[PDB]
Structures are given as C-alpha cells and as structure tokens.
Amino acid sequence: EALSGEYRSLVMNNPVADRDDIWRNLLVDGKVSAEITTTLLADAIAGIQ
C-alpha cells in the first residue's frame, strides 16, 4: 500500500490516481493478499493477457 502510494506520487506523477491505475499501468495486481501464490511465467502470462 505504501509503495503504491509513493509510486503513483513519484513515478506516475499523479498522486490522486487510483491504485488500480497501477494495476492497469504495470500489469500486476497489488491488492492481493499475501497468500495468493503464482508461478513467475504465470504472472507474466496474466500480465500480457
């Protein structure tokens, strides 16, 4: 959560952005819980999809 806030504040230069805009812009979901495990190829696949 903290990294995402600072990411869209510094990199995306749009602090008011939603956190899902990080998902759409970076092709990774950050709001997952710490138990959701996936492989690494599978995450690349879900991102490109």
Add this chain to the structure above:
Amino acid sequence: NLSIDGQPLSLPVFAAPADPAALLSAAAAASGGSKPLPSADIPAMRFP
C-alpha cells in the same frame, strides 16, 4: 484467498493452548535456638 462464497480457502490459525501450570508453594524448616541453662546453686538437701 477466499472462495466464491467468501469462505476461506486456507487452514485456520491453530494455537496450541498452554499447559496449566503446576502450583508450587513455599515450604521452610522451622528454626529456633536452644535455651541456656539457669544459674546453679547448692541446694539444702543432699544429692540423693
């Protein structure tokens, strides 16, 4: 990590309960000094 119905797909946090403590109280030996003998004096009567 829930299901479609919101039920958790993970196993719950179990926690082994604590073993009830063995009670223990203080036990001490009784302490005390002897008593000194009184002053002596020759009586009126003979020894027997």
